[PDB]
Amino acid sequence: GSLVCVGTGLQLAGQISVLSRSYIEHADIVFSLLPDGFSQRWLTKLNPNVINLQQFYAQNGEVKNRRDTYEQMVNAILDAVRAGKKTVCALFGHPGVFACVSHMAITRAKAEGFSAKMEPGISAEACLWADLGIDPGNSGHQSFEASQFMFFNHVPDPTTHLLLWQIAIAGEHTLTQFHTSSDRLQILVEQLNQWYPLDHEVVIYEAANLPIQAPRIERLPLANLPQAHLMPISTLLIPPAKKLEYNYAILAKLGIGPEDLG
Amino acid sequence: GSLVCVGTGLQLAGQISVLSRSYIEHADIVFSLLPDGFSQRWLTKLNPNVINLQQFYAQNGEVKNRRDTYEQMVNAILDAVRAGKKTVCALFGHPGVFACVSHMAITRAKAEGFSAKMEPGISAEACLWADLGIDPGNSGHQSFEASQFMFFNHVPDPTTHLLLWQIAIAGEHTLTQFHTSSDRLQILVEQLNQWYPLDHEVVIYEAANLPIQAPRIERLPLANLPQAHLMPISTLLIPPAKKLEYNYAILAKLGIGPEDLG
Amino acid sequence: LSDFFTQLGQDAQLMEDYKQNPEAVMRAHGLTDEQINAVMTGDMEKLKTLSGDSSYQSYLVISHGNGD
Amino acid sequence: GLSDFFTQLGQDAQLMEDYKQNPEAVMRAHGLTDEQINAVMTGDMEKLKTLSGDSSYQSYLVISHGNGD
């Protein structure tokens, strides 16, 4: 057996790569994690042999640590590979961007002597640069998981575009709830106030999943984040608080000044 | 007339999105910036009405500021839109990731009253996460243009995966040469030594463009960067110099500790 | 609904027709007045209900920030 | 020939998986020469361009700068 992990992009049917679609089409079995029922239908018409990985998330109010969800997803994928199936894992977005299941399945498959690889896809961050007309190169880019920003020591560069992913669960330390609380997001606000003013405009972004749907682009002061409506798919964009300033130290080592830049 | 900017990704033919390929197919005219002759051939078979933007780069040893090259690309795209053509700009990778031409063309077209938009594509960073088996979410990600890192004030977080893009022209201040010098890379090494040891393992990465080609994944100590062989497409990956450490201040405000983390 | 969305999402000619005239394209693909109203008001939950996936839960979080 | 093969291989997951099982057998069956196959096996992209009829295609791929606006 063998494993190829693909992404489907955020948009229905059209944001998958030509090659990745061909992998789904020719697979013996597909393990899916897709945004909605339109997407699920589209997959099932491409290849009817689908196991839905959604089933491994907490059902009906049960307490389940997401680390157990992800292990159960990895194990399901590997059982098909160990049985001899030409296996594809089809995840939304990019299969290895803020997504542990495909890297862990690939590490495990390789360790057991199976062919396994990952095909890049279009992630929610890719959709953001296009939707907001922002280039990450313009003043630089930083990405962190929102809860990892709160739990561990991270220092943002306030000249960059800063992304906090999974902002809807920011501070949710148990990994058993589907959303955080207003008071947790107020603590993140106070933490961010080390670098960003309380009236600094931030953007709640959600990439569209359907071709008739507009993306969510909600501008608001940082101070209003804790009252904002968030969903599991929401990303927080924090645009630069400061303009770029000349690095006179490095310019002097290069023997040049600002006037010399082309 | 109208504008749609698409990406073709890094790999020949298979790494464009299904919808982006259909935009190229139905275009009145395509302005291309593609990696090689195989990709150019592929495009020309999809849509024969192609203007190759490569012509706007300095030819035959002429001194030309890349700002003038980019302006001339934007102007050639807009002339087609203004004439009334259903115009597609097909760039490699993602059309708005370390790529100013599509954002500038979309800004100018909107200001002149035309319909203009950007479709996301698979960039070289999206290929890197797949080829190295690294999730940018694992300890977070930072991207800068290498020269901007040297010329302006940027502070990396050394717990993250740091990317310096366009490392081959690091410190080339004129925007008129195609490569930098070993002396300029040695100044970058000394600058980075504020956060990274001289023996810190870094990775020179190049995404493959052909299906028979392996990516370049060259591991070397940071100290050896100035003697390395770089190409215009080379990206420098600098993995974390430090492990994640517990943010006691925020954890206390949350009323939790390390032992509480799920 | 699902047939229309899946064609529209992949076909750049139909996408460009749609953007010119959303209601005329949706009507020409048989969408009901209530489906069209769900589209124009951005009501994604109503569209899912109208498609008969009324009862398919979907959590998209595939990573965490706790390490290890 | 060289171009037709690479374009199919890049798009067709069935051929891609045939190729991965047996690169030389797949290449030979799609008419590649021994010199084309040797260029693939040694990772010599420059020579592959020549055998395709390059006609010195020049390909600079930098579409941004770090000097600010």
Numbering used by the authors:
A (entry chain C), B (entry chain A): 2 to 263
C (entry chain D): 4 to 71
D (entry chain B): 3 to 71
Paper lines:
Among the mutations targeting residues directly interacting with the core peptide, SonM-Y93F shows the smallest changes in catalytic efficiency, as compared to the wt enzyme. However, the mutant exhibits the largest change in the apparent KM value for SAM (220 μM, a 3.8-fold increase as compared to wt). While, globally, the SonM-Y93F mutant structure complex does not reveal significant differences to wt, the structural observation that mutation of SonM-Y93 incurs a conformational change upon SAH binding is consistent with the increased apparent KM value and a role in binding SAM. Consequently, the cofactor cavity is significantly larger, and the ability of SonM-Y93 to switch between an inward trajectory towards the cofactor and outwards towards solvent and suggests a role in cofactor binding and release. This structural data corroborates the increase in the apparent KM of SAM for the SonM-Y93F mutant.
Here we report the discovery of type IV borosin natural product pathways (termed ‘split borosins’), featuring an iteratively acting α-N-methyltransferase and separate precursor peptide substrate from the metal-respiring bacterium Shewanella oneidensis. A five helical bundle at the N-terminus of SonA, now referred to as the borosin binding domain (BBD; 1–53), serves as the SonA leader peptide and is homologous to a portion of the fused clasp region of OphMA.
